[PDB]
Nucleic acid binder design. Sequence first.
RNA 1: UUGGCGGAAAGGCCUUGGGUGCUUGCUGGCGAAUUGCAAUGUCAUUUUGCGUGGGGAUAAAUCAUUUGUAUACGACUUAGA
RNA 2: GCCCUGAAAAUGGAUGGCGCUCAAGCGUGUUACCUAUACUCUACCGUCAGGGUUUGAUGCCCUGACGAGUAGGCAGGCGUGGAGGUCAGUGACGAAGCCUAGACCGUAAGGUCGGGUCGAACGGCCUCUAGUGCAGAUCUUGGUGGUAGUAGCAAAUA
RNA 3: AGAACUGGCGAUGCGGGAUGAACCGAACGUAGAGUUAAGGUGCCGGAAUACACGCUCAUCAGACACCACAAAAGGUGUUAG
RNA 4: GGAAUACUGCCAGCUGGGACUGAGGACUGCGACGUAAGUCAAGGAUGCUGGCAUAAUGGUUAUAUGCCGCCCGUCUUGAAA
RNA 5: GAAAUUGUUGAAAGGGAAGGGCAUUUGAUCAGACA
Lengths: 127, 197, 106, 48, 156, 111
Amino acid sequence: ASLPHPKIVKKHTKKFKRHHSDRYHRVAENWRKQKGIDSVVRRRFRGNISQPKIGYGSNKKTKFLSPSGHKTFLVANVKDLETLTMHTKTYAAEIAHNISAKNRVVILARAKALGIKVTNPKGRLAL
Amino acid sequence: VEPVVVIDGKGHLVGRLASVVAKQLLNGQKIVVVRAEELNISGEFFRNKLKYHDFLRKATAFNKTRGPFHFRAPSRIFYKALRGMVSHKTARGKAALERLKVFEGIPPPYDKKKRVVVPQALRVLRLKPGRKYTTLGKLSTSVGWKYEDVVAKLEAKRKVSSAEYYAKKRAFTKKVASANATAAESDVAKQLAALGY
Amino acid sequence: AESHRLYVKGKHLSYQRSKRVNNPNVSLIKIEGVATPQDAQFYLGKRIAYVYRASKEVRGSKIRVMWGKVTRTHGNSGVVRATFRNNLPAKTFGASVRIFLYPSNI
Amino acid sequence: LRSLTTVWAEHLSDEVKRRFYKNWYKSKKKAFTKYSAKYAQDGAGIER
Amino acid sequence: SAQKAPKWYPSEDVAALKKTRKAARPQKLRASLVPGTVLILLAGRFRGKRVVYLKHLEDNTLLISGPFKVNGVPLRRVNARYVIATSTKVSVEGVNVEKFNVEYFAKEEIKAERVEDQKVVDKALIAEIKKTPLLKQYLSASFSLKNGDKPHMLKF
Amino acid sequence: VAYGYPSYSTIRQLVYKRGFGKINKQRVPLSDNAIIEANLGKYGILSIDDLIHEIITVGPHFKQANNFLWPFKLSNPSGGWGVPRKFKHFIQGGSFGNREEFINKLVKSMN
RNA sequence: UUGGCGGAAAGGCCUUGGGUGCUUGCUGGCGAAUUGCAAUGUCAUUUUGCGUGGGGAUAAAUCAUUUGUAUACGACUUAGA
RNA sequence: GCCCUGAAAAUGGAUGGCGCUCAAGCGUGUUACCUAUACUCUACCGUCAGGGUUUGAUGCCCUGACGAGUAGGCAGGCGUGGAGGUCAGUGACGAAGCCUAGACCGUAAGGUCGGGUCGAACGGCCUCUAGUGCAGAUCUUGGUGGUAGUAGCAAAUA
RNA sequence: AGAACUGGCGAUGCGGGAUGAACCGAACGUAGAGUUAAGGUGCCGGAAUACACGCUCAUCAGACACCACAAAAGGUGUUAG
RNA sequence: GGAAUACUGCCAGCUGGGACUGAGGACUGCGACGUAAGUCAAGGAUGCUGGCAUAAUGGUUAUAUGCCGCCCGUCUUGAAA
RNA sequence: GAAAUUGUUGAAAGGGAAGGGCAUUUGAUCAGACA
Ligand SMILES: CN[C@@H]1[C@@H](O)[C@@H](O[C@@H]2[C@@H](O)[C@H](O[C@H]3O[C@H]([C@@H](C)O)[C@@H](O)[C@H](O)[C@H]3N)[C@@H](N)C[C@H]2N)OC[C@]1(C)O
Ligand SMILES: CN[C@@H]1[C@@H](O)[C@@H](O[C@@H]2[C@@H](O)[C@H](O[C@H]3O[C@H]([C@@H](C)O)[C@@H](O)[C@H](O)[C@H]3N)[C@@H](N)C[C@H]2N)OC[C@]1(C)O
Ligand SMILES: [Mg+2]
Ligand SMILES: [Mg+2]
Ligand SMILES: [Mg+2]
Ligand SMILES: [Mg+2]
Ligand SMILES: [Mg+2]
Ligand SMILES: [Mg+2]
Ligand SMILES: [Mg+2]
Ligand SMILES: [Mg+2]
Ligand SMILES: [Mg+2]
Ligand SMILES: [Mg+2]
Ligand SMILES: [Mg+2]
Ligand SMILES: [Mg+2]
Ligand SMILES: [Mg+2]
Ligand SMILES: [Mg+2]
Ligand SMILES: [Mg+2]
Ligand SMILES: [Mg+2]
Ligand SMILES: [Mg+2]
Ligand SMILES: [Mg+2]
Ligand SMILES: [Mg+2]
Ligand SMILES: [Mg+2]
Ligand SMILES: [Mg+2]
Ligand SMILES: [Mg+2]
Ligand SMILES: [Mg+2]
Ligand SMILES: [Mg+2]
Ligand SMILES: [Mg+2]
Ligand SMILES: [Mg+2]
Ligand SMILES: [Mg+2]
Ligand SMILES: [Mg+2]
Ligand SMILES: [Mg+2]
Ligand SMILES: [Mg+2]
Ligand SMILES: [Mg+2]
Ligand SMILES: [Mg+2]
Ligand SMILES: [Mg+2]
Ligand SMILES: [Mg+2]
Ligand SMILES: [Mg+2]
Ligand SMILES: [Mg+2]
Ligand SMILES: [Mg+2]
Ligand SMILES: [Mg+2]
Ligand SMILES: [Mg+2]
Ligand SMILES: [Mg+2]
Ligand SMILES: [Mg+2]
Ligand SMILES: [Mg+2]
Ligand SMILES: [Mg+2]
Ligand SMILES: [Mg+2]
Ligand SMILES: [Mg+2]
Ligand SMILES: [Mg+2]
Ligand SMILES: [Mg+2]
Ligand SMILES: [Mg+2]
Ligand SMILES: [Mg+2]
Ligand SMILES: [Mg+2]
Ligand SMILES: [Mg+2]
Ligand SMILES: [Mg+2]
Ligand SMILES: [Mg+2]
Ligand SMILES: [Mg+2]
Ligand SMILES: [Mg+2]
Ligand SMILES: [Mg+2]
Ligand SMILES: [Mg+2]
Ligand SMILES: [Mg+2]
Ligand SMILES: [Mg+2]
Ligand SMILES: [Mg+2]
Ligand SMILES: [Mg+2]
Ligand SMILES: [Mg+2]
Ligand SMILES: [Mg+2]
Ligand SMILES: [Mg+2]
């Protein structure tokens, strides 16, 4: 139900984990670029971790497309879900994390009505 | 090719028989060598002794235990030269080295199996005639390998009962020939030779 | 009969490698009896399967297969380069492989 | 050098028997009872 | 709203393809492939089977028969690349062959028609097989590489 | 460098396969004789074999007509260089210098 | 099953007698399809467990106590229906 | 010319290692082959540029070339506390926070989701403002390990 | 220790020199296929235990730029002058 | 005296096998084959068939295996030191 | 009611540390897609 798109090519599925966030607990994976003077990572010696740079950049044509081929859009209520009415083949809806259980079934409904894909159509579903 | 290759040690050059045996194990071909005590090494005896007393002196200083292990058995001196030609601290190399057996003499079952030879390792095709060379267990025996004469006695035992089988074989391959001769000239025979057989 | 074999026996040697750097995307095969690059021109494009066994059942079998194809001759003694749908595990250096007779040009 | 068999006499002394046992007073003293049965016949197993 | 909204949206209209230029041209099979040549089946259910080539088909496959009365292969489709063409031959000039086409094999056990079709084509072939002795028995036996067969050396 | 005296044969293949034009810079591939008559018509030279002509003949416009050509980008020798070490003179078994008519068989394995 | 040989890790070789399966050495009578044009198309041997029942067998060591030919402790060596 | 002699040092040891002697040594010739982040071709990313084009015109489209970087400069961005405006935004039918080798978007800073725990507030967008982003400073305060059931708990007669 | 020109290292990874700031090669967006450089192709190790004419036998042989040394002087060893 | 052949080069001579790639997405350009109407390999892959429709492809993850990877920060010509 | 750090359960691996990069096998576990 998506638009046609080329094969979605990633170029790096591995996450970039900041040098040594495996070593010290105090070092958070959250990527950081070493400025040190001796750092084998900055100097790019063989066998060290790869660094983020512009060439890894996803293709413009498949950029932002989830696996299903829809650019995902955040929806807190029907009015937001309704901005997607004409784009059913472009965007899918994601229901926001805080929307009340009762207001989800409302949206889930209106969306099935409009043919708008919803990505997280389970959250807070009594079953 | 074969699920096991028994090589005959006698009269091959240690270096080259090693190099060939190695790659086979790194390539997955189980190999067992026999009669290593009859291996040859280029250069005369006395040089290869000093060459062994040079290995002999190297030992880890504070504990002569954890230092280089100097093996005096002909099968070992050969296993050495192999081991050095494998990457033997890798898992891949533990694999290799486990495919290979080495022995003095030709012990059981190997003795009832045909054994091959490595042409590129043969001393007779490889040395130029008149270059001196050493015989392993003679070297090994000077560096302390105790069992040379137990090998000798047991090989002099084997080769007798080997000749007795080869006798019986020969006589029977003669019967074979004589029936196969009366098979020549027949309808089959000339048909067969027509096709290469 | 006894013999049912439809392929030539072949061995998995290395990855393609320089001295210190390998390349799992490409493997090096020894093919039974193929002695020369000439000889190995016969086998290019011919399709390899590596057969291994498992403990779990999957599509109805405890046997599994990785498929590949000879790409090009490798050096002077008849080694040949192949490339596999998913690369070979390199536990498999010294392992048996199967080079089937097809695509046939005979 | 390698030992390829042993042969033991029929009757073993209760001193030697005591050597195969860590606690002799508790044992059933079974040592070499079945071995002694090798003598019931002409002892062709022994002689072998 | 919990997410703002795009100022622009891409067009959901789907464009047509540029008019491709590739023509469907006849596939020429190799010189080994001539009707009445014996085939070795390399793969598939009947792999190892020795078979008789009949007609080059419209879908590029190869019509062959065992013949069935001998080795059990019926009239069947087979793919060129998956087969070794042997040098030994039998005359197909006695075999109808033209009934058979792509639709004769449409997928939609055995119908009365094919049963009869087979016995037909087979009688014609079993005739020319009897002409040359040992060839019935060679067409029944299966092909296997013995230790020492080197297909790159091997004449067929 | 290695250099020498190019044959008709190789000047042709050079400009057919790897000949490229300088048009407002921008390295334009040739492929159509009319891209030549655009730029090089001012001198004559409306065709690609007109271009080759000016080059092998060293005609009166050779400056413009050569300069027009993007510097050819050649692969490495497909048969490899011959000789083990490149940076002696061809005379001494190296590859650099003026190899004269031998420039041909090289530039062809590089094309 | 008859008899023999093999200790280098023998554990394997060789032989006699009958029973019995196959024999493509040769000649007959059937079967083979639809696994759909390929898909290893599954045929090997490793250890283990659980039941049925067929032979066969019905012990020790440890703690504790104890000796001092032993001992830092563990260990060692002895003793006790 | 090669070889021998001239040629003595302290842990045991290095043509890199094994080893090699009509070499796996030395001199020289010819091929073939192996493989760098280099060279060629194509895809994608970014940057610069030259065109085209009145409905995201800060836009779309065509085309070519380029891409190393400490000190450093510029740029476009990511995140935090608070402020002006907006979405009549989320919420006790569960806000915020925490947990989660579960799922998704980005090169990335980061963003989104599900499940758990939870209780009372909180977020998008366009702007404003700063006590705005930590691995280190023998950094400050607090908190906790390994050492470790360890050193030890033997002066003063019992 | 200190000057001249240039190229470098510092600030720079990558392939080769086992190893190594400066040598050789070649400089770096993400990938694919091809081909090469410097260096290599018994085995460790991808690649001819390739072909070819010779030299060399060392009771301390010899084995590849920068490079991890050797000299004067001798030999009725052998080789070609 | 007449050839052959080697050797070097040329062909806008014909042809088999293998590998990687299929960007783009109405038409528009340069041409090509045709007496013609048409056709084409001419400004970027389409035609035919089969399997599966699920953890099978893939993602993630632990691990094993091949190869590689020295502790970061710092001052310094030079830091794993 | 976060982290250091710790008990028990579950799983896994471990021949003189541990950790990393490329890649696949295997175990586990999951999204999507199709209809
Ligand atoms: C680079 N490593 C070196 C190691 O090679 C060696 O240094 C040598 C030293 O032995 C040499 O020096 C020594 O050895 C040489 C001979 C071997 O050239 C003799 O000529 C010289 O008289 C003697 N002093 C000197 N010429 C160069 C250093 N690189 O010893 C010191 C070291 C640091 O371990
Ligand atoms: C999960 N924790 C680790 C686990 O990763 C694994 O470690 C292996 C390790 O044993 C491997 O094995 C290696 O390391 C061990 C170790 C005891 O030092 C050595 O004894 C051994 O020689 C070496 N091959 C090593 N190559 C990789 C790790 N993933 O083994 C258990 C562990 C060490 O506790
Ligand atoms: Mg990612
Ligand atoms: Mg950690
Ligand atoms: Mg951490
Ligand atoms: Mg530095
Ligand atoms: Mg001793
Ligand atoms: Mg590559
Ligand atoms: Mg691959
Ligand atoms: Mg039959
Ligand atoms: Mg090549
Ligand atoms: Mg070359
Ligand atoms: Mg070279
Ligand atoms: Mg000397
Ligand atoms: Mg040495
Ligand atoms: Mg070498
Ligand atoms: Mg030489
Ligand atoms: Mg050659
Ligand atoms: Mg612009
Ligand atoms: Mg513009
Ligand atoms: Mg830069
Ligand atoms: Mg900076
Ligand atoms: Mg503040
Ligand atoms: Mg965690
Ligand atoms: Mg919740
Ligand atoms: Mg909550
Ligand atoms: Mg409250
Ligand atoms: Mg601050
Ligand atoms: Mg902080
Ligand atoms: Mg801190
Ligand atoms: Mg810092
Ligand atoms: Mg403390
Ligand atoms: Mg404490
Ligand atoms: Mg206590
Ligand atoms: Mg205590
Ligand atoms: Mg205490
Ligand atoms: Mg005290
Ligand atoms: Mg100085
Ligand atoms: Mg500095
Ligand atoms: Mg640097
Ligand atoms: Mg540099
Ligand atoms: Mg390097
Ligand atoms: Mg280096
Ligand atoms: Mg590249
Ligand atoms: Mg490459
Ligand atoms: Mg080694
Ligand atoms: Mg190799
Ligand atoms: Mg040779
Ligand atoms: Mg030679
Ligand atoms: Mg060196
Ligand atoms: Mg020619
Ligand atoms: Mg396309
Ligand atoms: Mg077709
Ligand atoms: Mg399947
Ligand atoms: Mg997989
Ligand atoms: Mg993985
Ligand atoms: Mg891991
Ligand atoms: Mg390393
Ligand atoms: Mg400092
Ligand atoms: Mg200093
Ligand atoms: Mg440092
Ligand atoms: Mg914790
Ligand atoms: Mg230990
Ligand atoms: Mg380590
Ligand atoms: Mg420890
Ligand atoms: Mg690893």
